[PDB]
Design a protein around this ligand. Structure first.
Ligand SMILES: [Mg+2]
Ligand SMILES: [Mg+2]
Ligand SMILES: [Zn+2]
Ligand SMILES: [Zn+2]
Lengths: 368, 368
């Protein structure tokens, strides 16, 4: 008889399907319908010397050799053993066997990769009080991804002797994010060992938008959000979906977009900063607060909503100079704004940041 | 211990692959490398009451139940039993089991006659930032087809020191598309090595139409579209069908057709570069935007609409020598335009391209 191990090997290699018609044999095996041929195993060289394609030497030599076995439903076992023996010689059955098993392996191999690389963008990476820590990141990617390497790729929000309201800070942080990406990320992407990137960013919104721009050409990226109670970076999905809705005020030719997702922004702060002659488009979340981005669906609906608004804005204003962005966005949406921006389909973006020391909005960074 | 029959069932349903990374386990099973966990079987609810997700009632109830078993390599068995027990809850592991076994069955169902060759037309084929990659293509042909060869056939939008706004560039790309097609595709067709062809094109629309013309006589072709959110080349089916509208303006001697599916094209832009003595036919999609081609039905309905429009244009202008095409089309529709054009009955096509930064439409290619 055929060993249980050879049965397992052949059924795995054969995908549990008839090698001539591909029909599914597992359900019948479980049902015990394999009374004529246990396990639906067919011998190419018959185990019996007097059988179809039998041989006095090779029949006993091959009766428990998996390289001599195929799976057949009862009908097609009868076809190669009784009705059409001459049609199905050892080489022809052997070639159907290789081809069936090669095909099965190739299709079960095709699937998205689960392994991911963590990318951190934050101040104080590697220090005791860093708000993104490797053990919290490695847990947060499960179970949708698993860490392919234990250690994150570290992009530093580098320590600086300039404050958020001095231009000096923004030039230093932008060029330093640029050097950093071009130094530790690009060579690993070029090299091809990274197939999925899990992103954990905590930085001023203009820098997070630039990070998103740097990630825009990548195919496998999952952005994470810092959640607030309990603190952590794992996606949750426990609340009703965030409701976003778009609007506009004014009719000047300076096009602005305020994005009030974690907070509200009144139109005054934009007109006080831009001209009085403005059009202020709006992307708002109902109940805007800094813990509003709860679930990945919330992030996807932001991406698609923001995409629709970007199209609508350029369609409504075919005389484009730029678009002036005024954000109050969770870190995950700020990265995704930069990631979905299309360098030559969208308007160029001028990103404003609230000077929290004294005074309102100031232009700190641009895309395009 | 787990029965030999349940081991066979699980190994067949699982395709002999780790349910967390999809790596192949049979070779290691045959080699006796399954020293820590025999057969690479992991219990979701542990067989041991004291184990991960163990239970005094359900552990013995399920220790020989195939619905509680998965296949795992040693590293991911340790991931769900030691490192990340809480993250990998029974419901989350059950999802993975159901998804893994559903995919394995659906892909092994694809019969041997459904094999396909991937054909790429794009810049930067084989580089990390190419927007068409072998792994996304081979996933995209499933479950309708399976890749007959692991490697795509690469037609390059070849690098040159020419710019798209000078004629030499277009002449260069056309001879290179012709040469590569004649040597990498055609010689394999005659014998039957290449039969069904799955096509992934990302190129300037006039070159994509030419690609379609090169495919025009082929009987087995499936064109793919590059989608956004999520990125990928797999056909989707989540939206209402695209709505197409055919219309016409003017009564002039020179016949034009604008095809605004991913964007709108106003009549000016046709009027001169061509003149005022024009008839401007139109084939537009309601809500034209760059991700509008969602489903394979949307592409088929484009084919039939464009076919009907071509006939109507020929009937309406029996003294017309040719037709001036002004496209703003998804990549898949552009290929299919070239593929359905009939030299026998249709007007010759002069294809125009939007000159970036200079501005305006310029004649870059012709068919017939
Ligand atoms: Mg037999
Ligand atoms: Mg276990
Ligand atoms: Zn059969
Ligand atoms: Zn694994």
């Amino acid at each position: 008889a055929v060993s249980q191990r050879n049965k397992l090997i052949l059924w795995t290699r054969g995908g549990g399907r008839c090698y001539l018609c591909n029909c599914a044999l597992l359900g019948d095996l479980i049902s015990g319908k394999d009374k004529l041929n246990k396990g639906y195993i067919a011998h190419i060289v018959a185990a019996e010397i007097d059988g179809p394609r039998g041989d006095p030497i090779r029949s006993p030599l091959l009766c428990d050799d998996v390289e001599n076995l195929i799976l057949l439903c009862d009908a097609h076992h009868r076809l190669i053993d009784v009705e059409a023996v001459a049609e199905y010689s050892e080489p022809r059955l052997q070639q159907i066997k290789r081809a069936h098993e090669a095909r099965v392996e190739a299709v079960t191999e095709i699937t998205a990769d689960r392994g991911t690389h963590m990318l951190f963008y934050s101040a104080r990476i590697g220090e005791h009080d860093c708000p993104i820590q490797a053990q919290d990141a490695r847990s947060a990617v499960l179970p949708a991804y698993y860490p392919k390497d234990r250690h994150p790729i570290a992009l530093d929000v580098a320590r600086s002797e300039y404050a958020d309201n001095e231009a000096q800070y923004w030039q230093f942080q932008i060029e330093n994010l640029n050097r950093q990406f071009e130094r530790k990320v690009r060579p690993l992407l070029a090299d091809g060992h990274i197939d999925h990137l899990s992103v954990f960013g905590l930085a001023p919104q203009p820098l997070l938008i630039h990070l998103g721009r740097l990630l825009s050409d990548l195919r496998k990226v999952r952005v994470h959000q810092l959640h607030r109670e309990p603190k952590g970076w794992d996606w949750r999905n426990e609340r009703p979906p965030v409701v976003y809705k778009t609007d506009r005020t004014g009719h000047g030719r300076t096009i602005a977009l305020k994005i009030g997702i974690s907070a509200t922004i009144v139109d005054e702060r934009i007109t006080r900063c831009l001209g009085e002659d403005t059009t202020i488009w709006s992307l708002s979340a109902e109940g805007a607060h800094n813990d509003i981005l709860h679930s990945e669906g919330d992030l996807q609906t932001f991406r698609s909503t923001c995409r629709r608004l970007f199209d609508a804005i350029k369609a409504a204003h075919p005389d484009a100079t730029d678009l002036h962005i005024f954000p109050a966005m969770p870190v995950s949406t700020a990265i995704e704004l930069g990631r979905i921006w299309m360098p030559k389909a969208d308007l160029p973006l001028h990103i404003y940041d609230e000077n929290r020391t004294a005074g309102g909005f100031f232009h700190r960074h641009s895309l395009g």
